[PDB]
Design a protein around this ligand. Structure first.
Ligand SMILES: *[C@@H]1O[C@H](CO)[C@@H](O)[C@H](O)[C@H]1NC(C)=O
Ligand SMILES: *[C@@H]1O[C@H](CO)[C@@H](O)[C@H](O)[C@H]1NC(C)=O
Ligand SMILES: *[C@@H]1O[C@H](CO)[C@@H](O)[C@H](O)[C@H]1NC(C)=O
Ligand SMILES: *[C@@H]1O[C@H](CO)[C@@H](O)[C@H](O)[C@H]1NC(C)=O
Ligand SMILES: *[C@@H]1O[C@H](CO)[C@@H](O)[C@H](O)[C@H]1NC(C)=O
Ligand SMILES: *[C@@H]1O[C@H](CO)[C@@H](O)[C@H](O)[C@H]1NC(C)=O
Ligand SMILES: *[C@@H]1O[C@H](CO)[C@@H](O)[C@H](O)[C@H]1NC(C)=O
Ligand SMILES: *[C@@H]1O[C@H](CO)[C@@H](O)[C@H](O)[C@H]1NC(C)=O
Ligand SMILES: *[C@@H]1O[C@H](CO)[C@@H](O)[C@H](O)[C@H]1NC(C)=O
Ligand SMILES: *[C@@H]1O[C@H](CO)[C@@H](O)[C@H](O)[C@H]1NC(C)=O
Ligand SMILES: *[C@@H]1O[C@H](CO)[C@@H](O)[C@H](O)[C@H]1NC(C)=O
Ligand SMILES: *[C@@H]1O[C@H](CO)[C@@H](O)[C@H](O)[C@H]1NC(C)=O
Lengths: 232, 232, 232
């Protein structure tokens, strides 16, 4: 039972690109069907880290659930949660991915961010977030009132620090700057911790994946050895 | 002739996890047998770099030898070589991997470390080392008497610098901090150089691998093309 | 129709190692034939990034064209374009890769470099460049009159900053220092931007690749699923 998907890419589907009306009551799947030359992927162009592995850790999924992880109403009273960009306009209305929140400062200097989530779903949780990369220091200051910020993400098995690189690139969809996307799988019983002083796009929704026994570690090269074994 | 292994992972076996009584007169093997859901892997939880490739560069091995590379008695007269952690307790006794030495300072400021080894085994040598990542600056100071240190590893074909990131993670096996593992293959005739001013877990033992003709470059994706060729 | 290649590696061929007389009227190919234990690869030893993927993005190619991207005569009036090294000596004459230019300063402090190229070939363009890593600060100063420099490379889909690490390694081909190689595929209509204040080896020639329909994204793991599908 292959999952049916339109003119969108997996990145668009998982990030929550408004242009993709994929919000349907679909649970498990054996395959993902994707247009070989998709258009509706990332609203704000940029690099999607480990994109190949995310089409291998979701190549076969059992029970699949979308749930809210960090509600905008209560999670960030001291920050702006309306980082809307006309980069894309569903119904001609500027909007952002429906699973992410682009946070900015207000009144004074961007207040420090310290939040965490504990996985009590009894399933592995896929958490997605981004890092903002301004085209200019003046724009970085406009959003965060600083010229120097970092994003740190910590879990039991994954730990990385992200540094924003300010530089102007060729315009893509009229964007001079760029957003990079990162993700990790949070094991049951663990905690994901986010710490930042600016240039953070926070997770809003997260996905719980049963996975089942359709794969091994899920990583690619582990979805081939099994395919070869099946032929042999 | 598959290699028999208990409830341990390859990481545990190669690092020297005391809980794994795998110290047997075993040389060559055609396969590695590993429990699909292993428990006895890394004593001090953390990230193991390039773990998939180390189960592909050792997927098929001819002559295999464990030898001492940097003896604790003579290699570090100016450092502590007893970085024991109760993280694990063989016979209920706190101990560390039997192939690695966690070095710390003594008396004064952690003395600078400059050591090297020349490969004269006529075989490729697998060298493993780690980098310490404190949960707090106070703990970094307790061990090294500094708040700023780096680890540099240089060879003919591999050259990387490691920077420790101090941050507290969720406790794993009661550990607030974390150790990352790195490795490289040193070609015959080359030299591996270690330079550091703190936060280093030095290699103690190293492995000489004949490898033979059971693989190509050894890298994965090079252990599949050959498998497909065999089917075809 | 496999491409015939001598005692050289792909890295040597694409970089332009003088010792490799592969400058022939060869266009498309279905396979690349390479000596399993090649000798004539990189003149100045060092690390070649993403080398496996460059033997998978060129595993099958249709029309293939070598063209000049940044002519030495007009592109750098304020820099030295004769960074010759005796590392190798075709006809016993010190020379450098015939697709790269090792730039150095002159008279005063290495002038800042800002250059770009727009892809109007209607084909994907493969751009190669390098980063210099001195064995000593004194040598870095001799070439660039500085002790601190960086290289930044920006495109629509790729954006990375390179930091040189000064350290002495074991001599390889009598070289105490080392050069690392990096590359990216520039899509039609995009622009590649190079910005640096030292330690840059600039692209001189670039390749236009038709590619055709002999592969998918071209990435490895995407050249295997197709091979397995063919068997099945
Ligand atoms: C994809 O685009 C084509 C052409 O506009 C359209 O006919 C098709 O319905 C689209 N797919 C979906 C799911 O809307
Ligand atoms: C979605 O794809 C259509 C082409 O069918 C394009 O016109 C539109 O701009 C795309 N929107 C986004 C957000 O990519
Ligand atoms: C917002 O700032 C006030 C200090 O003015 C602080 O007491 C409060 O806890 C902060 N709220 C959040 C969510 O950080
Ligand atoms: C966030 O906390 C760090 C110390 O951990 C501090 O140096 C930094 O200035 C704080 N951020 C802001 C905007 O004050
Ligand atoms: C692995 O664990 C099981 C269950 O305790 C035990 O019976 C088995 O002997 C263990 N394997 C080894 C090699 O000790
Ligand atoms: C080894 O595995 C056993 C479970 O059989 C567990 O109780 C013990 O704590 C583990 N020791 C280490 C060092 O992982
Ligand atoms: C230990 O320190 C002394 C200086 O007090 C130095 O002479 C000696 O060479 C050092 N030994 C090592 C192994 O670094
Ligand atoms: C190690 O040597 C470097 C210079 O290469 C020096 O800056 C550093 O302070 C030394 N380490 C210690 C603990 O003094
Ligand atoms: C490769 O080296 C061998 C041995 O010197 C030589 O005979 C052969 O002609 C070389 N290949 C090419 C293309 O020159
Ligand atoms: C090319 O290979 C030959 C061995 O046939 C070797 O003697 C020569 O030094 C190599 N030249 C380069 C630039 O690698
Ligand atoms: C060379 O330097 C002069 C300033 O003396 C500047 O006007 C000129 O544009 C520079 N040329 C290039 C190619 O950077
Ligand atoms: C290159 O420009 C930067 C500012 O973007 C400046 O800080 C740097 O010093 C310049 N390089 C040189 C050699 O002056």
């Amino acid at each position: 039972a292959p999952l049916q998907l339109g003119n969108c890419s997996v990145a668009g589907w998982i990030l929550g690109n408004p242009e993709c009306e994929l919000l349907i009551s679909k649970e498990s799947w054996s395959y993902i069907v994707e247009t070989p030359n998709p258009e509706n992927g990332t609203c704000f162009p940029g690099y999607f880290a480990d994109y190949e592995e995310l089409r291998c850790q979701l190549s076969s999924v059992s029970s699949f659930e979308r749930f809210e992880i960090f509600p905008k109403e209560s999670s960030w009273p001291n920050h702006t949660v309306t980082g809307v960009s006309a980069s894309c306009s569903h119904n001609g209305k500027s909007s952002f991915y429906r699973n992410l929140l682009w946070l900015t400062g207000k009144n004074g200097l961007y207040p420090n961010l310290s939040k965490s989530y504990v996985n009590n779903k009894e399933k592995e949780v896929l958490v997605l977030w981004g890092v903002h990369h301004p085209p200019n220091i003046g724009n970085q200051r406009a959003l965060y009132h600083t010229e120097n910020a970092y994003v740190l993400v910590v879990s039991s098995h994954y730990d990385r620090v992200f540094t924003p690189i300010i530089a102007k690139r060729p315009k893509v969809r009229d964007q001079e700057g760029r957003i990079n996307y990162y993700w990790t799988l949070l094991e049951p019983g663990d905690t994901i911790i986010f710490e930042a002083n600016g240039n953070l796009i926070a997770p809003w929704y997260a996905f719980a994946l049963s996975r089942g026994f359709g794969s091994g570690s899920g990583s690619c090269i582990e979805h081939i050895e099994n395919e070869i074994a099946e032929l042999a």
